[PDB]
Design a protein around this ligand. Structure first.
Ligand code: HEM
Ligand code: HEM
Ligand code: HEM
Ligand code: HEM
Ligand SMILES: [K+]
Ligand SMILES: [K+]
Ligand code: NA
Ligand code: NA
Ligand code: NA
Ligand code: NA
Ligand code: NA
Ligand code: NA
Ligand code: NA
Lengths: 156, 156, 156, 156, 156, 156, 156
């Protein structure tokens, strides 16, 4: 079904953001596992998987709309060097992702692509849940102290 | 455990090949599903998942060896425009992948990294199984005709 | 129990025929599997196993009759280059096998070895069932066309 | 996938050794059953089946590598006349088999056919287990005496 | 259904042989049990039962053919004094039984009593299996020695 | 089966290393249990058991190769006085063990003892997994602090 | 709990005896398995495991009493060259072990370490049961003959 050209551009932009997140979260996950912080590693693995599922839905929508999904252009991964940096890197990425999602939804509404809007709203809900998680973890580091926070994430 | 610098370079090169294949196969899978060739779509999805699992093991090994996994540099995806081209694109990618795997195993043997060698041999066995599948499909197109071959891949 | 010398010769001849067929059908099976014609590969494997079972019973009977089973002399395998040739090669072998089975039964009847006759009759029934299968496949190639026939034998 | 010509020659040589062993062990099995030494008959049957399984894997690998499996040439079966001779005949065959397996592995390593090497290594491990069994039986004949050894192999 | 007079005579001759065997095997069974060779006793009991079942089928066939089954004339039991002689007595009886069975089958074929032939062929197969057992036991006495052979038949 | 003298010497050296580790890990396990650090005690017990299983396989291989397993020579146990020292003692032992394993594999490859090589490679994988565990624990002591690290290992 | 220094010395002496027995019995077990005497191999394996359990309890008691368990000073293994010698080696080791256990119990009683006495009494009961097993085996070799004794220990 012939989609709106700018909608497809927006969908490819969100897809690009999800592709960055998949790799960033997968690497952070395996870094945490390497360090023995297995609870963080497992949670971050599930965040990566959730981004993979969003990327799948975007690819499927783009193809239905007769566009070309762009899996070639990978933007900058924000890789941290320690737990605090990794959480903040994920939060920085998520804040950029939600800004782009909001702009995409505006355009979908303008051209009456209500189904693409609905898909993007669902993704935005998931990304805001991730922001909640990240903000909460950074707050816990301050409340319980870093050593305790890391201790609480050694075991699954 | 401090690994050999060139082994880590080889492991990152294999990882880069797996990252290309993940995206290439995932996109091909969703293209075939879009076209209603659901048996091809499902098989290619499983091929993509298999490459994800190999990428995971490479990342884990690189981190154990105190190297930095490179998920940032994504090489050229070989995306075809019809079934015949897509299968050949996958085969071309796989033949490059096995070349690099053999060169990596040579070096692991030379520096006595026998555990990395074993991991790479297991990946190589999977990639050769993929080559067998691809060669077989291209042969079947010749034996049964393209229209019958596609028909046989409509339903799961 | 001391058997008739010419009976034992006949049983060793039939055994020789079964040993050809085991290997011919096993190789044809694995050729079909290599080509992705898995329904033909599976059926042909079961034909090979059935011949293995006949060979076992012949070996056991020869030994009971105090003869020496000959598993050393392997006659000519008739290996085809494509599906049509392979089926016809199997049929040519089977027609020779049934000729020899009938001559063996004649001699068993003449010297009153009724138990060996019964064993050979059961083998003959199986070989005639295989001829039926082979004639039917060759006829189906004519009726549905080669490409359709092969397509129908891709999936098990 | 086009294999190395000498690798394929080596694989066909190992296949030829497996085909001898299939027939030698099957006949030895049925001889032991004929004599009422059913525990030896059963064990030797399982040795024959194991060689059949190796032969299958070799045939499959040769076909993948675009070679022609040779099931036509059958080398010399070493058939004993009593239990001690039959066990030594099996051992003699196995020692030749392991020599050829090592030479095939050397060549596979030299041309970087690491998957064929791994297959041959697995077969070699099975053959060394068979050697262990055979040496152990011959040793038990010495330790418990021939009559006791045979008595212990009457019943399954 | 009025049968052929000579067929009925042959069936009564075979029945007479089965009646000798029932009693000879039953007595041997109970002699072996009395001596504490319970494995021989149980096997010989099952041989006696098998002859009882053959006698039943012969009686049934004779009555159908409107003949008079002869259960009155019992021929000479071959009773041994020790295990070796008892086995040889059974073998001697079985070799007479198979000679008579072959002669009966010849006549059934001549007069086209194909159902009686088939019954007799099934009995003949059973009697040859018994010959196999007996020859095997006598061979095992030679291979493992009498004392070990008897030891192996103390316990069921 | 007559093995290579230097292979057997290497296998006995690896065996000697495993015998040190059994006792060192078992004592460290029971020291941690005595101190109430039951999670460390249990994990270290399982490390000891894993070394026992490796020692068993080496003994079995040496005997198969007609060598004399050396369980008499016990090298120096590295026993620590506190958790930090005990982990470093285990790591020091493991790094010696992997050096010896690589040297043994080199020699096995040179003389074509591919089955002994494969055994040693499997042991090497296990020992590298143990190095990963140890390096990770030492890293966690730095990241969460010694008191938290010990607290986290009080309860199973 | 501060234990008596001489008690701790006695406990380390008993521990040293158990450590010899662990290794002696494990090696004898694997020697019997290599020779095909699998019933002896299994039984001796269980004897080795039982000694491992006693060693564990001694280590635990030493640590509770604030002593240093000595797993370093391995005494002389008594390794036989055949079944008869191996059994007598085990018996010689056990007779030394019970002598030392009795001397340790005397001292525990004298200083009122009744819990250590009870542990040693339980170990002594186990060691006397092993003596019973060993004396019985040596007696059976005399009563049934060596070849029969070994035959009875081929199969588990
Ligand atoms: C285009 C990028 C990717 C896409 C679209 C994608 C898609 C998916 C999907 C749909 C699943 C199944 C999720 C579920 O329903 O449970 C999955 C699983 C998985 N992915 Fe990805 N993925 C991508 C990249 C990656 C990468 C780069 C890695 C690792 C470096 C990875 C690792 C995994 C793993 C380990 C699994 C679980 C596989 C299993 O054990 O079943 N993925 N992926
Ligand atoms: C090219 C030579 C042969 C090949 C490749 C071959 C292969 C096989 C295979 C793959 C199986 C199934 C094994 C399993 O996974 O359970 C099998 C079974 C068997 N084979 Fe063979 N075989 C060969 C020759 C023979 C010969 C020469 C005999 C006897 C004279 C024989 C007797 C049997 C029997 C009795 C079975 C068990 C069948 C059943 O009851 O299901 N085979 N063979
Ligand atoms: C010395 C003479 C015989 C003895 C001692 C004998 C003994 C036995 C015994 C102990 C049984 C098992 C009964 C049970 O516990 O259920 C049996 C079964 C049987 N007997 Fe006899 N028998 C003799 C003669 C015969 C004869 C002469 C015939 C037929 C003409 C015969 C036909 C049968 C049949 C048909 C069975 C059942 C077998 C089955 O289907 O399991 N018996 N006999
Ligand atoms: C200080 C010396 C040793 C101690 C304290 C020790 C302790 C133990 C313990 C407590 C068990 C578990 C027993 C149970 O409850 O089932 C065990 C199992 C075992 N031990 Fe030892 N052991 C020692 C030395 C050895 C040696 C030297 C070997 C072989 C060379 C060995 C081989 C084994 C094996 C194979 C198992 C069974 C493991 C399994 O499959 O679960 N042990 N040991
Ligand atoms: K805490
Ligand atoms: K005996
Ligand atoms: Na479509
Ligand atoms: Na193919
Ligand atoms: Na042995
Ligand atoms: Na009696
Ligand atoms: Na026989
Ligand atoms: Na304490
Ligand atoms: Na680490």
């Amino acid at each position: 079904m012939k989609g709106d050209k700018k909608v497809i551009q927006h969908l490819n932009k969100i897809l690009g953001n999800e592709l960055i997140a998949i790799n960033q979260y997968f690497l952070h996950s395996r870094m945490w596992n390497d360090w023995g912080l297995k609870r963080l590693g497992a949670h971050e693995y599930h965040e990566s998987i959730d981004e993979m599922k969003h990327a799948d839905k975007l690819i499927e929508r783009i193809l239905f709309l007769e566009g070309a999904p762009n899996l070639q252009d990978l933007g900058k991964l924000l890789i941290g060097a320690n737990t605090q940096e990794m959480l903040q890197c994920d939060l920085n990425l998520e804040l950029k992702a939600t800004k782009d999602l909001r702009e995409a939804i505006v355009h979908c509404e303008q051209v009456h692509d209500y189904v693409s809007r609905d898909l993007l709203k669902d993704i935005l809900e998931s990304e805001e849940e991730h922001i909640d998680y990240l903000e909460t973890q950074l707050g816990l580091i301050q409340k319980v102290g870093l050593e305790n926070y890391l201790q609480s994430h050694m075991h699954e």
